[PDB]
Write a protein that binds this ligand. Structure first.
Ligand SMILES: Cc1cc2nc3c(=O)[nH]c(=O)nc-3n(C[C@H](O)[C@H](O)[C@H](O)COP(=O)(O)O)c2cc1C
Lengths: 128, 115
């Protein structure tokens, strides 16, 4: 959610109608992303600029975050392996690549794969 | 652990990132709410008010015939949990909840809140 407008049908209870269900009204709404640009969040200048310029995507196509960048946003896994929704910056996409290549591997294949990529790994750190 | 450790704080301090390159940085955001996020550096009071205010118009139109006179009113708003002259003598057995509702009054005012 981001505006009063898209949020309204969930207040009327009219949203649930698209699915042939009785009107199903809600009591309130929370806005997480929508506020990240506000004059008073500590989000850095260049970062607010980055956030805006992300084209969104309808609920129609959010599933694609799992694979490609989708509206400028990918999922990426934390150190613990739980999914995280991040802006698809260069660093984040490296993090995603390592997520798929290096961190992916069994703890047995770790140290060998690192050494065979040491030059590459060390380079991509320094760049992105 | 060296890679992913403590990696949320750069979004807010790019002066300490390699060369202030946001493109190196973890920023969190939703794919669907991203489309509604456009107006940079807009005061938070505005964003929130923008939503409430907009809900208020749509609501007025639909169920109030755009007449603000039709909106019922009350002294102060809130304090509701999701669930002319008299004398109350009190005993051991008097229900506390019932008792206060009496002294509270039905009209929402200073005496209602006082009890
Ligand atoms: C940058 C960022 C940091 C967040 N930190 C927390 C947190 O510390 N605890 C929590 O229960 N939810 C946290 N959330 C989840 C939001 O509070 C909320 O559930 C979600 O952002 C709403 O989705 P939306 O941004 O698409 O409106 C965070 C979301 C974002 C984008």
């Amino acid at each position: 959610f981001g505006s009063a407008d898209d949020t309204y049908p969930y207040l009327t209870g009219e949203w649930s109608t698209k699915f042939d269900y009785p009107p199903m009204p809600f009591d309130g709404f929370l806005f997480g992303s929508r506020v990240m640009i506000a004059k008073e969040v500590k989000t850095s200048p260049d970062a607010k600029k980055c956030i805006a310029a992300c084209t969104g995507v309808p609920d129609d196509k959010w599933e694609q975050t799992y694979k490609k960048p989708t509206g400028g946003i990918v999922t990426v896994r934390s150190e613990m392996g739980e999914p995280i929704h991040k802006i698809a910056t260069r660093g984040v996409m490296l993090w995603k690549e390592f997520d798929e290549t290096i961190f992916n591997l069994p703890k047995n294949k770790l140290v060998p794969t690192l050494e065979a990529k040491r030059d590459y790994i060390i380079s991509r750190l320094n760049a992105d | 652990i060296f890679f992913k450790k403590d990696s949320l704080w750069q979004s807010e301090h790019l002066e300490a990132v390699v060369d202030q390159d946001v493109q190196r940085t973890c920023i969190l955001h939703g794919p669907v709410a991203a489309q509604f996020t456009k107006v940079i550096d807009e005061p938070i009071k505005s964003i929130m008010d923008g939503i409430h205010d907009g809900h208020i118009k749509k609501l007025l139109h639909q169920y109030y015939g755009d007449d603000e006179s039709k909106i019922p009113a009350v002294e102060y708003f809130g304090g509701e949990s999701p669930v002319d002259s008299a004398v109350f003598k009190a005993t051991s057995s008097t229900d506390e909840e019932s008792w206060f509702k009496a002294l509270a009054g039905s009209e929402i005012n200073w005496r209602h809140a006082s009890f």
